Every structure is written in C-alpha cells, then in structure tokens.
Nucleic acid binder design. Structure first.
Lengths: 144, 123, 162, 383, 78, 80, 82, 95
RNA sequence: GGAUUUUUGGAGCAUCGACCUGGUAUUGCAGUACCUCCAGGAACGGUGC
C-alpha cells in the first residue's frame, strides 16, 4: 500500500513524494528502491428546566442617593445569589410600541425577577461584582 | 533604581522611631523644601514602601532580637519543620478555598446564563 | 583586565628553550596574580612579561614550578609567603622592578632551593653594598644578575653588617 | 551601617524566605527515594543556613541597647536624615536598574525543571554520600563488615546469614570475648551504623539525639540498666555480677574497677560507648536491617539471570536556482537578498511598499526595478 | 497606517471572499493572508492595505459587528 | 570458554585492579576490550608504600594487571 | 571499542614498569600498547637512603618518545590539548 | 565450533587443568600461589585455557615483615586471577 | 589475546653529573650529545653490585 504512487490522466504512474513519472508498470515498482526515494521517505439546559417558578411578591425600595435599591427576599436555603442585569425593552411578550428604554432586572431561583426601568443613559453600573451585595444573614439584596 | 530604594529604606527607618501618627521624622521634612514623592499614597511604590515600614515594625518587635533571643527558631529544627508543615497546610486550605470560590463563581455564571430574562415585572 | 582561569587556560603552553614546560602570558597587563592553580602542577616556568603587577603575591602551592619570570613589570613590594608556595623554585627573574629599599629582598631569602637570581635594571642595585647585602641575605643563590658569587664578596658580606 | 534596623530586617526576610522554601519543598509530592533524599538534604542545609543566620543576627544586640536611647529620642530626627540624604547626593549617572534586591534570595532558594536542586545545593550529589548497594537509605552495606568479621574470626564457617543473625542480637550473649580483638571491628561497625543513621535522616536533629544517647548511657546504662530477679545486677565493662545495689555501688568505685583491669571504666569506656551506640542504631534502624536481610536472602535465593536483572536496575539546488548570491537593495534600508527571483518577488510585496511609502512614492509598475532612492525620486518627479 | 489587521476568521474563508467582504466599506489596494504552505490552510488572520489611512481606519471602525461562519471578525489598526 | 568475554561485559562497576608492581587502582571500570585493557574514570591509585592519589581517568593494560576484585553484588552465572 | 582513541593528542602520563612516569602528548597509539608522546618528559623518583633525607623526583624532557607496551603499566590523563 | 568445544572440554577434563575441573564439580577450595608470595585459598567458579580463574569467597594470605614477619591475611567476596601470576595450583589444601 | 622482539611474568667498590679558588690561547656564524689544559679543597647527588 503505497500512498504516493497514483495514476495520471494519460495511463501512467506518478510518484508525488519524489515527483517522478513512469510509463510502464515495471518502472513504478522499481522506483521505490533507490537513493532519491529513500531521501524523500527520510525527509518526509438542566438547571433551567428544574428551576421552580411560583412568581411571589417582591419587596423592592428605591432611594435617590448622591456620592441604590434594596430588595427584601425570603430565605432561599441555597448558595445561588440573585443576579442583576440590564436589558433593552425591544424584546417582550407582547412587544408594545414606543419601547426605547433600558431596564435593570434582578432574578433569583425561588423568586421572580423584579425589573426597574431607567430613563437615563448611564447613571450607575449594573455589574454584579462591582456595586452589588447580598446579605444572607438578613437575606437582603442591595444594588448601587 | 537603587537610590530610590535606599531613600525609601531610609524613610522607613526614620519613620519607625516616631511616637505619634503625624509627629514623625518625615512629616516635618516635607516643609523643609525637600522633595519627597514617596510620601503620597497615589504612588505605586509607596504602598510597598510603607509595607517596608511594616518590615521596620518587624525590627520593632520585642522577640525580634532587641531585648530577647529566639530559641525555638534558632535551636530547634523540629519547631521550624512544624511551622513549615503548618504553612503548607494553610496554603493547601487557601488553595481549597480558592477552588471553592471558583466553583461557586462557575455555578453562579451557570445559573445566571440559564435564567429567563423575558419575565419582566414593574411594580 | 584582571587575571582569571580563562586567561591561563587559553594561553599557549609548550616547550621552552631550556627543555621545560612554559606557558606564554605576555601582553596581558594583569594588575594582580590570582587563580593560578589551574595548571595542576604541570608547568616548570611561568612568564609574566608586560604586566602591571604592583606586588608579587597570591601564588598557589605549585611544586612543579622551577622558574619565575616577572620581568618588565611594576613590582615595588615582594610577598612573604613565596617559599611555602614554590618549594622547588631555582630561577627568579625580577628584573626591571620598582625596588628602592634594601629590605625588599629579605622575604626573597626564604627560598633555600634558589640558585639563580636576576635583579638587574632596578633602583635597589644603584645603592652601595647591594650585591654584598644580596649575598649575605641569601647564601644559597649561586648566580645573581648573570654573575656568579665570589669568595671575596662572600667574605666582605660576612664581615660587614656584624 | 544599620546593624539593628537594616541587617536585622534582612536576616528576618532571609529566614522568612528559607521558611517559605522549606514549606514549598514539604508541600510538593515525591515520586522517587533519591529525589526525596536530595530534597531532605536540601531542606536540612536550608535549616542549617537559617540557624546560622539566626545565630549571627542574635549576636547583634550589644550596640543596640546603647543606640536605642538615641534612635527613639525626640530631640533627634530630620537632622541625621538630612545629613544622610546629603551624603547620598552623589552622581546618578549609573543608569542601571537592579531588581535583584528581593528576587535573588527567592531565586537562590528555588530549583529548575532540568535539575531539582537549589543554588547553594547545586554541587550536592547523592552518590558522594551513599553507595549503590545501599540505595540512598533503602538497604545497608554489610559485605565489608562480614569480610572483616571473617578475617577476625579466622574461620570460613560463617556466612552472611550467620553474621546477620549474630548482628541482630541486642542484649544476648556475644559470639566472641569482650576483651578480644572484636572490639576494634565493633567500633568501626558502630561508626558505620551511626553514619548510615545520619545519612538516612538528614532532617532529624543529630546533636540532640547524640546528647540524648549520651545521657541514656551516663545516667541509666552506668547505673544498672538491666535489672534482674550475680543475676540481679550485671556490669557492661567489668562483666561480673552483683549481689545487691549497695554491693554494686561499693564495687563501682573500686580500684580494679577504676584503673586496675584491662576492661575497666578508664580504658574500655569508648568500647562500651560504641557498643551502646551500636545497640541504639540496631534498635532504631531495625526495619532497615530487616529489609537489607530480606534483600540479601532474595539475592541469594535467585539465579544468575534474576540477579543480573536486579543489579542492572543542498549546494546544487542553490547553484542551479541562482541562490546564495548577495544582492543589496538600497530602497528598503540597504537590505540583503539571496536571489534575483527572490528579490523580484519581494519587490512587489508589502515590505518594499512600506519602504517606498516613507519617501512618498506610490506603489506602481514603473518603480518595480528601482533600487536606489535617488533614481526612484527622479522617476517619481519625472512622472 | 493604511493597513488594518483582520482576525477571528475561519479556515474556510478565502482571499477573494475576504476581498469582497472588505470592498463593501472601501476599495482595498492589497490583501495579504499568511498561510502555511505545508498544510495549505489559513491561520485566521490577514492584513488589508487600502489606498489611504482614513479609509482604512473607517473600514476598521465599521467592521466591529461582522460575523463570518458564526465567528465574529475583529478589526484592529496596524 | 575464555575469561576475557566475562570481563568485557562489565560497565559502571566499581572494581579494584591490583597491578604487578605493588599498584592497586580502585574505581568505576568504564571500558574493557579483548586484550584486558581496563579503562576507568575517577579512580584512586595506590602504589607500593605510597600515598593514594586520585585520577580522573586511567587506562591499565592487560599484561600489567595482576589480579582483580569485584563486589559481592555481581552474579557470576550470567556473566559466563 | 574505541576507548584508547578518545584520549588522543592530550598530555597523558604513562607509568613505566621501573617506577618512572612519562608525561607527554599521546598522539599515536597501536594495538601493542605503544605510544608516540611528542614533547615528553620522564620523571623518576630517587631513593633517599637516609633518615632525614626527603624523596625527590628527577625529571628530564626528551621530546618525541616511542614507548613500547612491554614497559608501560598504566596511562592517566593529565592535560587537555593546547 | 562443536568439535573445538568438545576438544577443549576433553582437555579440561583429562588434562593438566583437570584438578581445576574438580573446582567446579564438587565446589572444593583450591590453593593458588601468586608471584608476590600471596597464597589464595578458595574455590574457582570459572576457568579458561589461559589459567584465568574466578574465585568466590577467597582468602589471600601473605607474609609482611614490619623482627619477625606476621601472617596478615584478607578475605575477598569475589576476585579474578590471571594466569600470568599463577605459579602453583593445589587441588586439596591442608587447612 | 595462555611460553625468544611487545598481551597470559624473570618474578664497602666502580662510574657519571656537579660546587668553590689560581695561570693559560682561541673574539669565532650555527642547529649540535658533549667540548682548551693543569694544580688544590669538598662535610653534594644519580645508577649497578
């Protein structure tokens, strides 16, 4: 099984390892033994479906600070922290018109997501690890 | 960078012999027309250099060799081996805590990328 | 440029004209002689021509050495531990030096096997009774400055400085 | 010089770096016995260096008590600091950064990937302290001791198994006399056993163990360490029994017991100390002796092949294509080219275009064979 | 200044395809795609040199939201 | 069978070759030929009533070697 | 093997049967344990035959020396090729 | 070949070295005399035509004058003795 | 690599180099043992028996 000897479109034999040609069949088998042929041979989804959704009543309180929202949540009995994220109003269930604002929504696993619309462009940061906290001893979330 | 390091070491040696927070040997030198940019906290080296002053606190300890002599760290290899084993156990516990924090961050990233972002409720 | 093991290993070591192993180290201007123990006692003559050695000291223990060439240098002082490092030293070429006082040859008399000496072209030889002091200091030297010792010179050396 | 401020802080930083290196050596896992023995020897050398540094820093406290009254005084302060700053106001023309103020002790106490050895321990080798038959503490060489025992006994009726059975005893009857010529071989065997015990565990305190062995030999072995129920009390030096403790206490200070015998406590004390050290080495390293005896039995019970298996463990292409010919191109910064076709291919490339764009000439077909900058500028000005 | 580096492309992308993609924002004078001659596959990076630096900067700043074969293509100044 | 083939199949073995004129060289034998030429590296040679010197390399001939000494951890059945 | 040709053209010291040592540049050898030492020097120790006399070694250089295998005992490497 | 090996075995079993053939048959100790007046007592594990012997657990005894000379002896685990220094070989020693 | 040239073993005397003082002629171009002769003192060393 020689991977270099092939048949051309003229009824001959071609060796692509040394780039040689052979007319008859006796010259292709005799071209493997030699110095040039030897030199050429030597050179070469689960967590989303199991999440319970009961949609309880959230308790969010906003306060205009100057240099902050506080959400009171029940005991979740788990290490999963509620995540906050800022999204646009273009994606909705009914797609209502004149929706060109942004909304910061906080979502948890045993509870529903609470969303607050922000008319301003950029007045704060919606990062989870920058200006957010979640006290598990009192079970209260703070977003600044 | 040897002259700046020597000046920082001299400032850490002169500031460690003070009896108050603001009454030191470097606060009065700033008003004596002496340029000292290593005293401000905005510099990148001063946060190490004041830590070198903490090393001066290591020269200000009573068991550091000023009024007493250490016998467990100087005449007992078994105590040094036990301290090295305790340091290795503390490093292993810190690595396990870092692995647990990385696993918790991965679990939070998996839970945040699987929640529904279309259930909006404005109250 | 200081003297190290690389200057001695890269030097040309061959046979000299006196049928002895000699290593050529001319044109080096070494201010101090050190780390000369890399020869492993396989040489009999060491040349130190055209050097800036101020003092001939820092020599390791070499028993195979039999000739020292310190000519054309600026050696003003001489070391005291020269007999304990070269016990088989016989030839000493200390020509063209900066010796002014007569006390510089007092550590030179510690070598008992020394027979050849060369103190020519030196300021210590310009003073009076220099050859008599050299004969009275080291009596084992037979050839001093390409000249043999004399019986009358030895008698004048033994009579003077009594 | 700040001997109490800078030198003490440098010694504390060196001790902390040595402790961190020892913790990094102890926290890493081991795969071979020789590498573990080398790591233990490096840790013992680092502990000895840290103890020497602590002993050198602990002696720098005589002038500190006299200088503490002037250093902590409020009358002094910025005057000496200004004098030291004026003394350190020399020429700063030596533009050379030195980041090895703290990184050099961190790199000296570390190892490389090709060789797991420290920088002070780079010349250390396990083959200069242990033999090939010992296996770096795996077994003990007892062939020379057996040959010496066969030469001293002057008989060929003692094999290696008989010598291993005779050497396994600790408080039994000896095979030869105590005042015979076997004590000169027993002292050398005790010295070899002490050397093997010191080389098998370099991290253990050898001086404290030697002091404890000397205290056990002085306070216990010299006062009847083997009680009985002539059989009540026996002496190791005099080799005689005793009736009671009072008779042994009266005979301990006797004149034949002090210097009036050939095996008294004045001349035969070193032989008794060597016998006690050999007994302590046999009691402490009995597992290594049992492993060496098992290895000797496995080597004796095997054949020759099993013992041999156990003991072994082109110019023509450059001349035809026009290559290897130096050509200078003054357009692209007088670059070198090793071929006419290669230079013709690199002329219509990105490097020649970036070189010609600095002079202001566009990349066209008229400046393909242009080499000099003046001819290219004349061709650009003519068009 | 007139050359922009385009990265993040798949191996199935070709040089006429990249030229037709780059010609939507401006005519490119040259396009160099480094590829290994041993295997005959691209490296996923290329350099497009335009006729001016301002057009190349506009093509680099206007191709920040391009997606080819599911992969986002990044454009940087070079 | 000749005993030269048993001595030629020895590498990295710490042996001791005692010569004829009171000389004994102990070291790791690195090479052995059919003419009993023992080439060793980093050996210690002791002459008749002389101090034992240390040599980085040595090459003792066959006619000058008088006796040899091998350790006990060397089988003779597989080498013959 | 080729262990004898590995130390060629180096300053080797061959010990003779009479007790002398010839140190020279061993450039050529043969199968009969011969050596062609260029710029060689032979050193022979002399007997003191006294109580306070020390042991000396007289050394004399001869140049190119052809040492046969009947007198050579052991050769040791002493110096690299200059 | 096989005939030369059979001739060598016949010359070792029925020749002058046949007592050496007693050293490898019943594993008996032999006494070999050296050129330096050192008698080696011990059995021979391997031999050849050039009198090269391989001794195992041998004892070499000689006389060294410090007076009267003492019989300083040593014991070797394994040793090899060439045939050039072999002077007299005794099959059955006295003691 | 087992027997005459190499590798399976012959294991107080004589001679030479010097050291130290006196008289004597050659002033000369060459790759070398050596290198004019006589008298006195030696408490210098190497080899063989």
């Amino acid at each position: 099984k020689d991977p270099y000897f092939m048949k051309n479109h003229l009824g001959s034999y071609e060796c692509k390892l040394c780039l040689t040609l052979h007319n008859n069949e006796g010259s292709y088998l005799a071209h493997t033994q030699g110095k040039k042929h030897q030199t050429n041979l030597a050179r070469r989804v689960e967590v989303k479906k199991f999440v319970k959704i009961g949609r309880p009543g959230y308790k969010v309180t906003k306060q205009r600070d100057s240099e902050l929202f506080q959400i009171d949540y029940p005991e979740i009995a788990e290490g999963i922290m509620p995540r906050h994220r800022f999204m646009s109003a273009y994606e909705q269930r009914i797609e209502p018109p004149d929706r060109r604002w942004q909304y910061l929504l906080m979502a948890a696993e045993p509870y529903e997501t609470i969303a607050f619309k922000v008319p301003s462009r950029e007045i704060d940061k919606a990062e989870g690890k920058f200006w957010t906290h979640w006290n598990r001893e009192t079970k209260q979330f703070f977003l600044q | 960078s040897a002259f700046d390091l020597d000046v920082v070491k001299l400032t850490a040696q002169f500031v460690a012999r003070n009896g108050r927070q603001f009454l030191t040997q470097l606060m009065q030198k700033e008003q004596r027309n002496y340029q000292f940019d290593f005293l401000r906290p905005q510099h990148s080296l001063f946060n190490y250099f004041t830590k070198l002053v903490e090393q001066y606190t290591k020269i200000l300890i009573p068991p550091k060799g000023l009024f007493s002599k250490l016998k467990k760290e100087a005449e007992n290899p078994r105590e040094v081996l036990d301290q090295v084993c305790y340091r290795v156990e503390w490093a292993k516990f810190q690595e396990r805590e870092r692995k647990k924090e990385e696993e918790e961050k991965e679990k939070e990233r998996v839970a945040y990328a699987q929640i529904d972002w279309h259930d909006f409720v404005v109250v | 440029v200081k003297l190290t093991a690389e200057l001695i290993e890269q030097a040309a070591q061959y046979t000299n004209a006196v049928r002895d192993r000699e290593l050529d180290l001319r044109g080096y201007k070494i201010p101090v002689i050190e780390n000369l123990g890399a020869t492993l006692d396989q040489f009999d003559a060491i040349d130190f021509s055209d050097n800036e050695i101020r003092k001939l000291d820092g020599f390791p223990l070499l028993r195979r050495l039999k000739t020292l060439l310190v000519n054309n240098n600026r050696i003003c002082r001489i070391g005291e531990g020269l007999d304990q490092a070269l016990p088989c030293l016989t030839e000493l070429i200390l020509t063209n030096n900066s010796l002014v006082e007569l006390g510089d040859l007092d550590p030179l008399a510690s070598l008992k096997s020394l027979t050849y000496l060369s103190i020519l072209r030196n300021p210590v030889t310009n003073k009076k009774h220099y050859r008599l002091y050299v004969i009275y200091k080291v009596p084992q030297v037979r050839v001093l400055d390409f000249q043999k010792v004399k019986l009358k010179e030895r008698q004048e050396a033994e009579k003077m400085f009594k | 010089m700040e001997t109490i401020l800078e030198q003490q802080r440098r010694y504390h930083e060196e001790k902390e770096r040595l402790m961190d290196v020892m913790a990094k050596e102890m926290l890493t896992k081991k795969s071979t016995l020789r590498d573990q023995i080398n790591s233990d020897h490096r840790t013992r050398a680092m502990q000895d260096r840290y103890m020497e540094v602590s002993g050198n820093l602990r002696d720098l406290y005589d002038d500190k008590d006299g200088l503490r009254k002037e250093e902590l005084n409020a009358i002094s302060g910025p005057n000496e600091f200004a004098e030291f700053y004026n003394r350190l106001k020399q020429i700063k023309e030596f533009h050379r950064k030195h980041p090895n103020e703290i990184c050099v002790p961190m790199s000296v106490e570390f190892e490389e990937l090709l060789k797991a050895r420290e920088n002070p321990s780079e010349e250390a080798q396990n083959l200069v302290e242990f033999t090939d038959e010992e296996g770096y503490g795996r077994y003990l060489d007892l062939h020379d001791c057996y040959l010496k025992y066969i030469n001293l006994k002057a008989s060929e009726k003692l094999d290696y198994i008989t010598y291993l059975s005779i050497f396994d005893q600790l408080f039994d009857i000896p095979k030869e006399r105590k005042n015979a010529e076997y004590k000169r071989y027993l002292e050398m065997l005790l010295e070899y056993l002490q050397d093997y015990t010191d080389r098998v565990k370099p991290l253990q305190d050898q001086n404290e163990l030697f002091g404890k062995i000397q205290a056990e030999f002085e306070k216990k072995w010299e006062n009847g360490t083997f009680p009985g129920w002539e059989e009540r009390a026996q002496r190791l030096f005099s080799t005689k029994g005793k009736s009671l403790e009072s008779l042994d206490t009266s005979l301990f200070a006797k004149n034949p017991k002090s210097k009036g015998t050939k095996r008294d406590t004045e001349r035969n004390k070193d032989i008794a100390f060597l016998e006690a050290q050999i007994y302590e080495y046999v009691e402490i390293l009995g597992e290594q002796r049992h492993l060496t005896h098992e290895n000797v039995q496995r080597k004796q019970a095997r054949t020759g092949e099993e013992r041999e298996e156990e003991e072994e463990e082109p110019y023509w292409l450059y001349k035809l294509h026009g290559l290897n010919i130096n050509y200078n191109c003054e357009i692209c910064g007088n670059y070198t080219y090793r071929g006419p076709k290669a230079f013709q291919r690199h002329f219509a490339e990105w490097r020649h275009a970036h070189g010609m764009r600095c002079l202001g000439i566009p990349n066209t077909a008229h400046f393909a064979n242009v080499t000099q900058i003046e001819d290219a500028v004349s061709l650009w000005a003519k068009l | 200044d007139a050359t922009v580096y385009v990265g993040g492309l798949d191996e199935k992308v070709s040089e006429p395809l990249l030229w037709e993609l780059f010609l939507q924002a401006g005519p490119v004078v040259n396009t160099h795609m480094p590829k290994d001659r041993v295997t005959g596959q691209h490296q996923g990076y290329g350099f497009v040199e335009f006729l001016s630096e301002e057009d190349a900067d506009y093509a680099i700043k206007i191709m920040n939201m391009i997606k080819l074969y599911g992969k986002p293509i990044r454009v940087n100044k070079a | 069978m000749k005993l030269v083939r048993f001595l030629m199949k020895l590498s990295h073995e710490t042996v001791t070759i005692e010569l004829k004129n009171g000389t004994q060289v102990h070291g790791t034998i690195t090479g052995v030929d059919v003419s009993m030429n023992t080439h060793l590296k980093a050996v210690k040679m002791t002459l008749k009533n002389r101090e034992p010197v240390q040599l980085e390399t040595l090459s003792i001939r066959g006619n000058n070697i008088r006796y040899f000494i091998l350790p006990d951890s060397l089988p003779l059945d597989t080498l013959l | 093997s080729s262990k004898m040709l590995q130390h060629i053209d180096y300053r080797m010291r061959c010990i003779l049967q009479d007790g002398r040592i010839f140190i020279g540049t061993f450039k050529a050898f043969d199968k009969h344990m011969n050596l062609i030492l260029c710029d060689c020097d032979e050193f022979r120790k002399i007997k003191p035959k006294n109580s306070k006399q020390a042991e000396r070694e007289e050394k004399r250089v001869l140049g190119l020396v052809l040492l046969r295998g009947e007198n050579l005992v052991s050769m040791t490497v002493e110096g690299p090729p200059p | 070949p096989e005939e030369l090996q059979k001739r060598e075995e016949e010359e070792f079993n029925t020749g002058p070295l046949s007592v050496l053939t007693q050293s490898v048959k019943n594993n008996t100790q032999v006494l070999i005399n050296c050129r330096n007046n050192k008698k080696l007592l011990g059995r021979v594990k391997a031999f050849d035509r050039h009198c090269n012997m391989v001794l195992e657990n041998v004892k070499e005894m000689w006389t060294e004058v410090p007076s009267k000379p003492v019989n300083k002896d040593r014991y070797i685990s394994k040793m090899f003795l060439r045939g050039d220094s072999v002077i007299v070989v005794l099959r059955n020693p006295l003691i």
